[PDB]
Design a protein around this ligand. Structure first.
Ligand SMILES: NCCNS(=O)(=O)c1cccc2cnccc12
Length: 301
């Protein structure tokens, strides 16, 4: 098991602007002095003991690193190196400086469902690689779908933040409560057995929001949000879904299913007609169907 470098990160990197933060990790933009190449440095604060309200445990850091070290894919963030001092364990990761997918979408003059499925298909490709390796992401949500270079015509998506990711064991049961309520599967809220299926639910939510601007199960309070999810109470309200094709809806509807066995696995979602058209007729429908960008820009900004 590769050991973490014990040197001071600042002796090897020039630390720069803050890229983001969140709970127990601050991500700063850095540059290695020897090579001159740029990266992003994720400082994870370690726990003091175990009750300790501040910090992440050793296991959960070692899990994340273990998982990150396995993954080399074009739609997934790649690890460069790991450092450690007395307070923080610092992950030096690929620099993805294109911002969030949704921020880029929110600036477009127009967006067809074909253009939409391009970006969704990248997310699917990435999740397929993970799932083939029996790795659940468990935190798929818009702010975790980043872009490399927004200045190109079709930006390239990179999945980030594997802090809740987990290797799925055959025969072993895994239950936990985590994630952002708005995007979590029913099995998470119910504290029922989890697996690869939860990611597919969250792709459903992501697609629902991407096409419409509205969130499927979001309530006025966390309570309401959780009750909507558990009953699977959403609709395709024509105020948001008048421009939306039947196939787009079929896709979302087969993902947002309570029964984990009946939900689409990743390989099925890649092969869905909305992602992979079977004839040239349905390819035209997708190219002609538009997304309502103002509904989207309103619920974003
Ligand atoms: N707490 C999440 C902070 N998100 S973030 O700073 O944008 C961010 C998080 C993780 C990896 C990144 C790689 N490159 C740029 C930014 C990155």
């Amino acid at each position: 098991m590769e050991p973490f470098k014990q040197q001071k990160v600042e002796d090897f990197y020039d630390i720069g602007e803050e890229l983001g933060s969140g709970q127990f990790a601050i991500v700063k933009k850095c540059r290695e002095k020897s090579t001159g190449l740029e990266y992003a440095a994720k400082f994870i604060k370690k726990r003091q003991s175990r009750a300790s309200r501040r910090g992440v445990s050793r296991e959960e850091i070692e899990r994340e690193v273990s998982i990150l070290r396995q993954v080399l894919h074009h739609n997934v963030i790649t690890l460069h190196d790991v450092y450690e001092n007395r307070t923080d364990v610092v992950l030096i990761l690929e620099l993805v400086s294109g911002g969030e997918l949704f921020d880029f979408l929110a600036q477009k003059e127009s967006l067809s469902e074909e253009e939409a499925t391009s970006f969704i298909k990248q997310i699917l490709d990435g999740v397929n690689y993970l799932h083939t390796k029996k790795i659940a992401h468990f935190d798929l949500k818009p702010e975790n779908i980043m872009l490399l270079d927004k200045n190109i015509p079709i930006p390239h998506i990179k999945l980030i933040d594997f802090g809740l990711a987990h290797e799925i064991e055959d025969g072993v049961e895994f239950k936990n409560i985590f994630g952002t309520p708005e995007f979590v599967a029913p099995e998470i809220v119910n504290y029922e057995p989890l697996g690869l299926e939860a990611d597919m639910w969250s792709i459903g939510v992501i697609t629902y929001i991407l096409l419409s601007g509205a969130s499927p199960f979001l309530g006025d309070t966390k309570q309401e949000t959780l009750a909507n999810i558990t009953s699977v109470s959403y609709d395709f309200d024509e105020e948001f879904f008048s421009h939306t094709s039947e196939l787009a809806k079929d896709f979302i509807r087969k993902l947002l299913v309570k029964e984990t066995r009946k939900r689409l696995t990743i390989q099925e979602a890649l092969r869905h007609p909305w992602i992979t058209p079977v004839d040239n007729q349905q390819a035209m429908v997708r190219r002609e169907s538009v997304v309502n960008l103002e509904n989207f820009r309103k619920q974003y900004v």
